[PDB]
C-alpha cells in the first residue's frame, strides 16, 4: 500500500526545467508549477555558514557570474550573484559566449527589467527554505549533493542539515535521494518519516541483482540508460512495480531530452518523468490525454 503507486503520471520539473529556465531558481520552478508540473526536482549545497543552497554544482562557476566552492562562501556572498548569467534556452547553462546569447542575464544583478510578474530575487541562488516557503503544497524532490566524489562527509553533513530543516515543516510530501548511499542512510535515521530513493549502489543491487533496496525506499529514480546498458525499460519497470516501487526516469545527457524519447518513458508505464523541457511535456502529456493525479486520462499500460 505505497501511495506513490497512484500518483502518475508526474511532469517533475528537473531543476525547475534547465533548458526552458535557468536551473534551480525562484522562477524556473514558480514557472514550472504554474504551467502544470505536479512536481519539483531540485538540488542542493550547503554554505560556509550552514545554509541549504539550491544549486546542482559544487561551484558556482558555471550557473553565475562568481567562482568557488559553495562551501566556501557565505550565503550573502552567493545570494547577490546572477544565477541566470549564463542560461541560454535550449542548451542549460554554457560561459563564456556572445552576450547577447543570455535572454535573463542582468535582470538579478537589476540591470535588465524581470519578465512581468517576477523580481530580481527570483533570479538568485534560492534558500531551500525559500522554496518551501513558496511551495506549501507542491510535492519537491530533493537530491543531496556534495563537494567532491571524494569528499564523503561533504555529503554526510548535508544530509545532517537536510533532515533536520525538512523536520521542521512536518511535511512528509517530499523524496529525498542522493547519488551517495551512504548519505540517504543518514537522512534515513534522522528523518525516519520522509519518503527517499536510493543511491547508486542499492540501484545497481536491485537492478543488477535482485537485491530490494533500503526499506523506507518508495521509488526507484533511474537514468534511461547508463554506460551503455538500458535502465528504464518496461521489463524493468514491471519489476519494479511488481516489488511496490514506483519508476520516475531522467535524462540529463543518458538519452536525448526529445518528444520521442519522453514517449517511449511514458509507453514504458513509467510513473513519473523529469525533463528539461517540462513545458513540453506537458503538452505531450495533454494531447495524449494521460491521466495525471486527481485527472482523469488514460493510462498507457
Ligand atoms: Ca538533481
Not at 537530491?143 to 512528509?172: C, M, Q, V, W, Y
Not at 523541457?277 to 498507457?300: Q, S, T
Request: proline share 9%.
Amino acid at each position: 500500500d505505497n501511495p506513490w503507486l497512484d500518483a502518475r503520471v508526474l511532469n517533475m520539473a528537473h531543476a525547475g526545467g534547465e533548458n526552458e529556465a535557468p536551473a534551480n531558481t525562484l522562477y524556473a520552478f514558480k514557472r514550472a508549477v504554474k504551467l502544470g508540473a505536479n512536481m519539483l526536482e531540485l538540488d542542493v549545497q550547503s554554505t560556509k555558514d550552514d545554509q541549504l543552497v539550491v544549486i546542482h554544482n559544487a561551484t558556482v562557476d558555471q550557473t553565475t557570474d562568481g567562482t568557488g566552492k559553495v562551501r566556501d562562501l557565505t550565503f550573502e556572498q552567493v545570494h547577490e550573484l546572477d544565477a541566470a548569467y549564463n542560461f541560454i534556452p535550449g542548451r542549460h547553462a554554457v560561459p563564456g559566449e556572445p552576450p547577447e546569447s543570455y535572454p535573463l542575464r542582468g535582470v538579478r544583478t537589476g540591470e535588465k527589467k524581470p519578465p512581468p510578474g517576477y523580481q530580481p530575487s527570483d533570479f538568485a541562488i534560492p534558500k531551500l527554505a525559500d522554496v518551501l516557503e513558496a511551495f506549501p503544497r507542491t510535492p519537491i524532490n530533493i537530491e543531496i549533493k556534495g563537494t567532491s566524489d571524494a569528499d564523503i562527509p561533504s555529503f554526510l553533513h548535508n544530509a545532517k542539515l537536510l533532515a533536520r530543516l525538512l523536520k521542521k515543516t512536518g511535511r512528509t510530501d517530499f523524496i529525498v535521494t542522493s547519488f551517495n548511499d551512504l548519505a540517504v542512510a543518514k537522512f534515513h535515521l534522522l528523518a525516519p518519516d520522509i519518503p527517499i530513493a536510493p543511491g547508486m549502489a542499492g540501484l545497481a543491487a536491485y537492478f543488477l541483482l535482485g537485491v530490494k533496496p533500503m526499506h523506507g525506499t518508495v521509488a526507484l529514480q533511474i537514468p534511461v540508460r547508463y554506460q551503455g546498458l538500458e535502465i528504464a525499460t518496461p521489463e524493468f519497470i514491471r519489476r519494479a512495480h511488481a516489488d511496490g516501487y514506483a519508476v520516475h526516469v531522467w535524462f540529463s545527457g543518458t538519452a536525448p531530452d526529445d518528444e520521442a524519447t519522453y514517449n517511449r518513458i511514458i509507453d514504458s508505464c513509467a510513473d513519473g518523468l523529469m525533463p528539461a523541457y517540462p513545458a513540453l511535456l506537458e503538452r505531450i502529456l495533454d494531447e495524449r490525454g494521460i491521466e495525471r493525479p486527481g485527472r482523469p486520462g488514460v493510462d498507457p499500460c
